Amino acid sequence: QLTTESMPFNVAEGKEVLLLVHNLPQQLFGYSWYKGERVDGNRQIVGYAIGTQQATPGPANSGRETIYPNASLLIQNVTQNDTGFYTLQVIKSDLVNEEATGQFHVYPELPKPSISSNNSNPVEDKDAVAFTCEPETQDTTYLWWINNQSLPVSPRLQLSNGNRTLTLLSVTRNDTGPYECEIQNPVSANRSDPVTLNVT
Amino acid sequence: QLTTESMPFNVAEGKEVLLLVHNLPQQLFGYSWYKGERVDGNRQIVGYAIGTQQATPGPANSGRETIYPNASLLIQNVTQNDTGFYTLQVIKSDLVNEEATGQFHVYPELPKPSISSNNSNPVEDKDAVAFTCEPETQDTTYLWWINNQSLPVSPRLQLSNGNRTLTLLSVTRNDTGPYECEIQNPVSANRSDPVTLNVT
Amino acid sequence: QLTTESMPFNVAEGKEVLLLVHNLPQQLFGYSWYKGERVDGNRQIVGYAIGTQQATPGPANSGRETIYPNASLLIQNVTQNDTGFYTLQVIKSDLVNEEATGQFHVYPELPKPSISSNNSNPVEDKDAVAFTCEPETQDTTYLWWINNQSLPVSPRLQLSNGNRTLTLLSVTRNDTGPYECEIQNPVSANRSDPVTLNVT
Amino acid sequence: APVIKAGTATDSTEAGVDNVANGVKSSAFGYDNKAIEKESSAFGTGNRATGEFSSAFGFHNIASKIHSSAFGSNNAADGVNSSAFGFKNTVSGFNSSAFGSQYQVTGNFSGAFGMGEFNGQYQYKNEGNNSYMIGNKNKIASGSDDNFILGNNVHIGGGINNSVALGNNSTVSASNTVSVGSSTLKRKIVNVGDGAISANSSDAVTGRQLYSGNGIDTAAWQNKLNVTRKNDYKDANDIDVNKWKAKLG
Amino acid sequence: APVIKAGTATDSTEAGVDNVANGVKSSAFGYDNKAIEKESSAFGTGNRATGEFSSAFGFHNIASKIHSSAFGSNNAADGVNSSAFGFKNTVSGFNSSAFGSQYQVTGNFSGAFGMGEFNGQYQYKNEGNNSYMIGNKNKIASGSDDNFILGNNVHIGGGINNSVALGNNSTVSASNTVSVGSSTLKRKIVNVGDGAISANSSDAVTGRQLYSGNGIDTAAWQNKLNVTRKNDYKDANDIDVNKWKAKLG
Amino acid sequence: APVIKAGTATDSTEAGVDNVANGVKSSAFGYDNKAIEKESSAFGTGNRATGEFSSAFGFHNIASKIHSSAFGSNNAADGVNSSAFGFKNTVSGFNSSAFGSQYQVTGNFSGAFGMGEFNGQYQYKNEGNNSYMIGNKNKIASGSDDNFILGNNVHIGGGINNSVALGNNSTVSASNTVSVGSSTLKRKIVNVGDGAISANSSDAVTGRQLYSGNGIDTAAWQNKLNVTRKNDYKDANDIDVNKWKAKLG
Ligand SMILES: *[C@@H]1O[C@H](CO)[C@@H](O)[C@H](O)[C@H]1NC(C)=O
Ligand SMILES: *[C@@H]1O[C@H](CO)[C@@H](O)[C@H](O)[C@H]1NC(C)=O
Ligand SMILES: *[C@@H]1O[C@H](CO)[C@@H](O)[C@H](O)[C@H]1NC(C)=O
Ligand SMILES: *[C@@H]1O[C@H](CO)[C@@H](O)[C@H](O)[C@H]1NC(C)=O
Ligand SMILES: *[C@@H]1O[C@H](CO)[C@@H](O)[C@H](O)[C@H]1NC(C)=O
Ligand SMILES: *[C@@H]1O[C@H](CO)[C@@H](O)[C@H](O)[C@H]1NC(C)=O
Ligand SMILES: *[C@@H]1O[C@H](CO)[C@@H](O)[C@H](O)[C@H]1NC(C)=O
Ligand SMILES: *[C@@H]1O[C@H](CO)[C@@H](O)[C@H](O)[C@H]1NC(C)=O
Ligand SMILES: *[C@@H]1O[C@H](CO)[C@@H](O)[C@H](O)[C@H]1NC(C)=O
Ligand SMILES: *[C@@H]1O[C@H](CO)[C@@H](O)[C@H](O)[C@H]1NC(C)=O
Ligand SMILES: *[C@@H]1O[C@H](CO)[C@@H](O)[C@H](O)[C@H]1NC(C)=O
Ligand SMILES: *[C@@H]1O[C@H](CO)[C@@H](O)[C@H](O)[C@H]1NC(C)=O
Ligand SMILES: *[C@@H]1O[C@H](CO)[C@@H](O)[C@H](O)[C@H]1NC(C)=O
Ligand SMILES: *[C@@H]1O[C@H](CO)[C@@H](O)[C@H](O)[C@H]1NC(C)=O
Ligand SMILES: *[C@@H]1O[C@H](CO)[C@@H](O)[C@H](O)[C@H]1NC(C)=O
Ligand SMILES: *[C@@H]1O[C@H](CO)[C@@H](O)[C@H](O)[C@H]1NC(C)=O
Ligand SMILES: *[C@@H]1O[C@H](CO)[C@@H](O)[C@H](O)[C@H]1NC(C)=O
Ligand SMILES: *[C@@H]1O[C@H](CO)[C@@H](O)[C@H](O)[C@H]1NC(C)=O
C-alpha cells in the first residue's frame, strides 16, 4: 500500500515542507504530484520519468516545488494558500496507475499580543473588571497566566467570546498580580506583557 | 434497395436533368457517380465524402455536373452525347459498397418540317400523287392531318418509307383540303405549313 | 543440401579462384559470403539481393571479390593471406538462413632450386659426399634425379633434413652422372641445373 | 483453463481466459480482452475495443471510435479514423495518426512521428490542425495550424500558422516562415543552386552570386550609391563650371 | 458457436466462426477470416491473406503478395514487401509503405504518411518512384520520381524529378529545386548562418551579409558599376586633357 | 489438430498447433508461437515474445524488451519501448521506432521511415542518437547525433551533428548546416519571401533584393568600393590642388 507523510504536518509560513513516500512499488515508470484530491492534468505540479531521468514541471508549478528520485516532494517558500490535499500518482512498469494522498496545514507567525481592561481602577471592595487580548487572529488557542501560574479554574473567573475575554466577577485587593495572556497555534507561541492590578 | 430515378426521363438538348436517389442507407461514408454501367476509376464523374463534407470532381467530369448531399446528381447543358447509363456507388459506414443504376435519353429540338408533292396539278378524275415531309430526322414519329382532322385509315391512303411518305392512290376533287404533317419525339412537337390541293 | 566447391582447390599466388555453389534453393532472398568458418557482420565480403538485384561489398571486401547472380564468388589476384575457410549464407524466401562452407589453399610459385656439395673432389675409392638443395621453402616436396632416372631406393642413398640432404655413403667412379634436384608443390614444379661428380 | 465460446451477441467469439465480447460479429482473443461494439476485435492482453469497426491489437490498447486502430503497447486511439501505433500513443483528433513512443495528437488531420514524454501526463502534444511533427519532444500549441516540424525540442506557440521548422533545437517565432535554427544556433544552407537575379525573381542568391554581382541592376545601384561613372568623369559630364574654376583657377 | 478446428491444409488453424484456412501452416482467427496461402495469417474481422508469408490484422484487411502487412482498418497491401498501416491505405508498389488514412501509393520504393481522400476512389495518390509524402492531400503524378513533400495540398505534375516541397500549400514547378511556397504565398527563411562569400562557394547569403557586403569582389563590382575610385579622383588618373581644358579653360 | 489449452503458467493460453506460452497472463495464438515472458503476446506464425509486456504480431516477429512491438514480417524489436513495424525492421535502440522495409535503427531515441537493404546484413542503418531518416538507402554513422534526413542515398559520416539533408542524393559534410544537394547536383530554393536587410538580420535574401539593392548600407558600401559621390565630384570636394593644377595647367 502506498502512503505519503508530510514532514512536518504543520509548517510556519515561509518555511519548507517535505512529503515522504513509503512502500513505493518495485518496478516503476514515473511519478506525478497533483494539487487537490483529484488527479487532473491541469493540477499537475511536477512529474518524474525514471526512464529518461527527467523532472518536468507541470502547469500548476510555481517554481517552489522539486521532485526527488525517491518520489519525495519538497515545497519551499510555503504560503497560507498552499494548505490543502496533495495526491501522488505512481505509474508501475505495466503502466497501471497507483494513487496516494497527503496533506499539511500552513499557519502564520503569531505575533506579540496585548491586553486591555475597560476599568483602569478596580474598586477594592468589589468590581466586575474584564480582561481581553485585542489582536484577533484566526484558529488560535487562548490561555491566561496569573501570578506567573496557570489560572485556577473557578466560576469567579468568567470567560466570554470563547475564552479570549477574561471577566473577574468580584475582585479583591488580594488578587493584585501580573495579568498576561497567550495566543497559540500548532506552530508557534510567545507571550504578551504582564498587566498589573491597581488598588490601594 | 437502392434505386435511382431520372427527372425527367427524356430531356431536350441544352436543358438539365436531375437524378434522384431513394432508400439511401442510414450510415454512409460517401458517394460516387460513374458514367456507364461499370464502376471504373476512369469513368468517375464526381464523388462526395460525408466525413469531411467535400465534393471532388472526377476524371470524367466536364464542369456541368454537381453532386448534392442527398446523393443527387445534376447535369446542366445536357447534350446528345450524354445519353447512356449512369451508376451510383454508395459506400456505407463499414465501407461495403452498394450499387445502383439510372439512365436518361437526350433528344433534339425538332423544327418546323416541310412537305413536297411530286405532282403539282393533280388530275381531277384520278391521280396517284404522293405527299412527303422532306426534313429527315432520326427516331421521330410522323402523323398526317387533313382538313385539320386525323387521317381516316383506308387502303386508299398509302404510306411508304415507313409513313413519312403519304401517297393518294386515287384522288378526287372532293378531297381538296389543307395537307399538313407533324414530327414528334418524346420531348417536343410542332407543325409545318398547311398544303392545299389544286383542282378546277 | 547446400555445398560449395573451390575451383581450383590450390591456386598459385596472383591467380584467381572461383567458388561454385550447388543445390541452390529454388526460392531465394539473397546471398552473402563471409571470411572464416563463422557468420559475422564484420567478416562479410560481399552480398547480393535478388529483389533489387544489387551487389553490395561488405566491410571485409578488398576490391578483388565479385558475386555472381548464381551465388558464385570470384576472387582475383589471390594472395597467401587469403588461405582459409569461407562460408556462404543463403536466405530463402521465408528468410530462414542456410549456411555452407568452402576453402582453398594458396601456394607460392617456386623457382629454380640449386644444389650444393661439401666436397668438390670425391675420392674415387670411397667417400661420403653429401648433396643438398639449399633454397629452403615451406610445405613442398623434394625429389632427386640421377642419370635422368629416379633415384634407386637403397640404404646407400642416405637422406637428411627430411630428404633435402642426400648423402652418398661410399662413392664409386661408376656413380658419375648428372645430379638434379626437384622442388614441387601442389600448384607448380620446375627443376634445377644438373650437377656432376669429378673423378679420374 | 482457456476456453472457446460464444459471446453475448450473434457471431461473437471469446478465445482465452476472462474475455468479454458483446458486439455483433465481435471477437476477443487473448487474456482480459473486451470487444463491446459491432465488428470490433481485441487481440492480445487487456485490450479494449469500445467503438464500431475498431481494433486494438497488442497490450493494454484502447480503441473508442468508428474506425480506430491501437496497435502496440498502451495506445489509446480515441478519434474517428484515427490510428495510434507504437508505445503509449494517444490520438484524440479526427483522421489523425501517431507513430512512436509517448506522443499525443489532439489536433484534427494531424500527425506525429517520434518520441515525446509521459511522466504522469503527456508533456509534448500536437494540438494543431493539419500539422505534422517528426522528431523528439516537439510541441504545437492549440490554434497554431498548418505547421510542420523536422527536428527536436521545437515548441510552437499560439498564433503561428504556415510555418516549417528544420533541425535540432530550431525555433519558430512568426507565421509564413521557414526556420533553420534558433537565435543561439544558426545553420548554414549549403549546396544551393545559383539564383535568378532579376526584377521579380523570388530565389535564394548564393555566395558566388553576391561575390561577383552578375545581373544586378547597374542603373538602380548607381543611384542608391552616388557613383561617378568613368565616362562622365573622363568627359566632364555633370559638373559645375562657375566654382570648379574657383578652386582650380 | 465458435469452434477450433483444422483447415484444409497441414497445420492450418481456424479459430472463431465462419473461418477458412487453406495454406500450409496458415491460420485464420476471428470472424469471416480467410488465409489461403502458405504461412499466411488473418486475425480480426473479415480479413483476407492471399499471399505467402502475408498477414492481415484488423478489420477488412487484404494482403496479396509475398510479404504483405495490412494492419488497421480496410487496408489493402498489394505489393511485394509492402506495408499498409492505418485506415483505408492501399499500397500497390514494390517495397513501398503507407501510414495514415485514405492514402494510395502506386510507386516503387515510395511512401506516404498523412491523410488523403477516398470518396469512391483515391483522389490523392503517390505514383512516383523513390518519393515520399508527409502531409495532407498531396499528389505526385506518374513519371515524377525522387520527389519529397513536407506539407499539405502539394500537387506535383509530370516530369518533375529531384524536387522538395516544404510547407502548407507549397508549389513545385521545375526539377532540381526546393520550394518553400507558391506564387501567392512566399515564405521567409529565418535563422540562417552567414554565407561563405567567395569565387566558388554555393551558400545562402543573409540580410547582414548583403547589408554590409563584406568579402565582395571589390574589383569585379568596380567594372560592372563604372566606379571612379577616390584614388584616381585624388591623383587625376585617366582623364582627357584636350577635353577638360575646353570646359575648364 | 489445433487445440486450446493452458500454457505452463497461470492464465497462459495456447491456441493453434505447436504453441508455447510460459509467462503469467501470456498467450500464443497461431502456429509455432512462443510467449515466454509475463503478459507477452505472440499472434501469427512463428512469432517470439521474449520480453515482458511485449507483443509480436505477424510472421516471424521477435520482441525482446520491456515494451516491444514487432508488427509485420520478420521484424525484430530489441529495445526498451521500441517499435518495429513493416517488413524486416530491426530496432536495437532505446525508445526508437522504425517503419518501412529492411531498415535498422541502433541509435537511441532515433527513427527511420523508408526502405534500406538487407542482403545478409543490414547495409543501411541509423547509428545516431536523436536522429531521424525518411527516404531510401540512407546512412548515419555512429557518433553523429541530432541529424535529420529527407532524401535518398544520403550517407552521414562520423562527427557530424545538428545537420539536415534534403532531397535525393544530398550530401552532408559539416555540422550545423542544412544541405539541399551535393557538389555535383545543386538545388535552387524558389518562392522565398523577401529578406530583412539590416545590420543584424539573419534571413535569406532573394533575387529581387540583390537585383535592386534596396536597404543596403549606402555608407559602408561606399568605403569598400572607393566611389566618388556626385555630391563631391560636382562640387570639387576632396581634391588635390597642387597636382590638379599641374596636369590641368
Ligand atoms: C528522498 O530524497 C531526500 C533527499 O535525499 C531525502 O531527504 C528523503 O529522506 C528521501 N525519502 C526517503 C523515504 O528516504
Ligand atoms: C519567499 O516568499 C516571498 C514572497 O514571494 C519572497 O519575497 C521571498 O523572496 C521568498 N524567499 C525565497 C528564498 O524564495
Ligand atoms: C514572537 O513575538 C514576536 C513579536 O510579535 C513575533 O514577531 C514572532 O513571530 C514571535 N515568534 C514566535 C515563535 O512566536
Ligand atoms: C468593565 O469592568 C467593569 C467593572 O465594574 C464591569 O462592570 C463591566 O462589566 C466591564 N465591561 C465589559 C464590556 O466587560
Ligand atoms: C514564570 O516566569 C518565567 C518568565 O518570566 C516563565 O518562563 C516561567 O515559565 C514562569 N513559571 C512557570 C512555572 O511556568
Ligand atoms: C480556552 O478555549 C479552548 C476552546 O477550544 C478550550 O479548549 C480551552 O479549554 C479553553 N480554556 C479555558 C481555561 O477555558
Ligand atoms: C436533393 O437536393 C436537391 C436540392 O436541394 C433537391 O432538389 C432534391 O429534391 C433532393 N433529393 C431528394 C430525394 O430529396
Ligand atoms: C451550353 O453549351 C453550349 C456549347 O458548349 C455553350 O455554347 C453554351 O454557352 C452553354 N450555356 C451555359 C449556360 O452553360
Ligand atoms: C418548334 O420549331 C422550332 C424551329 O423550327 C424549333 O426550334 C423548336 O424546337 C420547336 N419547338 C417544339 C416544342 O417542338
Ligand atoms: C408522282 O405523281 C403521280 C400522279 O399520278 C404518281 O403516278 C406517281 O406515283 C408519283 N411518283 C412518286 C415517286 O411518288
Ligand atoms: C383545328 O384548328 C386549329 C388549327 O388552326 C388546331 O389548333 C386545332 O387543334 C384543330 N382541331 C383539332 C381537333 O385538332
Ligand atoms: C406511323 O409509323 C409508326 C411506326 O412505329 C407507327 O407506330 C404508326 O402507327 C404509324 N401511323 C400510321 C397512320 O400508319
Ligand atoms: C556462376 O556465374 C558465373 C558467370 O556466368 C559463371 O562463370 C559460373 O560458371 C556460374 N556457376 C555455375 C555453377 O553455373
Ligand atoms: C595484384 O596485387 C599486386 C600488389 O597489390 C599489384 O601490384 C597488382 O597490380 C595486382 N594485379 C591486378 C591485375 O590487379
Ligand atoms: C619456374 O621457376 C621460376 C623462377 O625460377 C618461377 O618464376 C616459376 O613460377 C616457376 N614455374 C613453375 C611451373 O614451377
Ligand atoms: C661431408 O662429405 C664428407 C665426405 O667424406 C663426409 O665425411 C661428411 O659426412 C659430409 N659432412 C656433411 C655435414 O655433409
Ligand atoms: C630425360 O631428359 C629430359 C630432359 O633432358 C626430361 O624432360 C625427360 O623427362 C627425362 N626422362 C625421364 C624418364 O625423366
Ligand atoms: C621425400 O620427402 C617426403 C616427406 O613426406 C616423403 O613423403 C618422400 O617419400 C620422400 N622421398 C624419399 C625417396 O624418401
mmCIF file of C-alpha atoms and ligand atoms in Angstrom, chain C residues 141-142 151 159 163, ligand 18:
data_model
loop_
_atom_site.group_PDB
_atom_site.id
_atom_site.type_symbol
_atom_site.label_atom_id
_atom_site.label_comp_id
_atom_site.label_asym_id
_atom_site.label_seq_id
_atom_site.Cartn_x
_atom_site.Cartn_y
_atom_site.Cartn_z
ATOM 1 C CA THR C 141 58.016 -31.995 -51.790
ATOM 2 C CA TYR C 142 61.639 -32.825 -52.628
ATOM 3 C CA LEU C 151 66.890 -42.491 -57.574
ATOM 4 C CA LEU C 159 68.572 -38.686 -46.677
ATOM 5 C CA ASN C 163 65.051 -35.591 -47.640
HETATM 6 C C1 LIG G 18 60.817 -37.053 -49.603
HETATM 7 O O1 LIG G 18 60.031 -36.293 -48.558
HETATM 8 C C2 LIG G 18 58.616 -36.693 -48.339
HETATM 9 C C3 LIG G 18 58.162 -36.228 -46.948
HETATM 10 O O2 LIG G 18 56.854 -36.716 -46.692
HETATM 11 C C4 LIG G 18 58.371 -38.187 -48.399
HETATM 12 O O3 LIG G 18 56.964 -38.402 -48.439
HETATM 13 C C5 LIG G 18 59.006 -38.769 -49.623
HETATM 14 O O4 LIG G 18 58.801 -40.217 -49.619
HETATM 15 C C6 LIG G 18 60.459 -38.526 -49.577
HETATM 16 N N1 LIG G 18 61.157 -39.232 -50.738
HETATM 17 C C7 LIG G 18 62.142 -40.281 -50.471
HETATM 18 C C8 LIG G 18 62.850 -41.012 -51.663
HETATM 19 O O5 LIG G 18 62.400 -40.581 -49.337
#
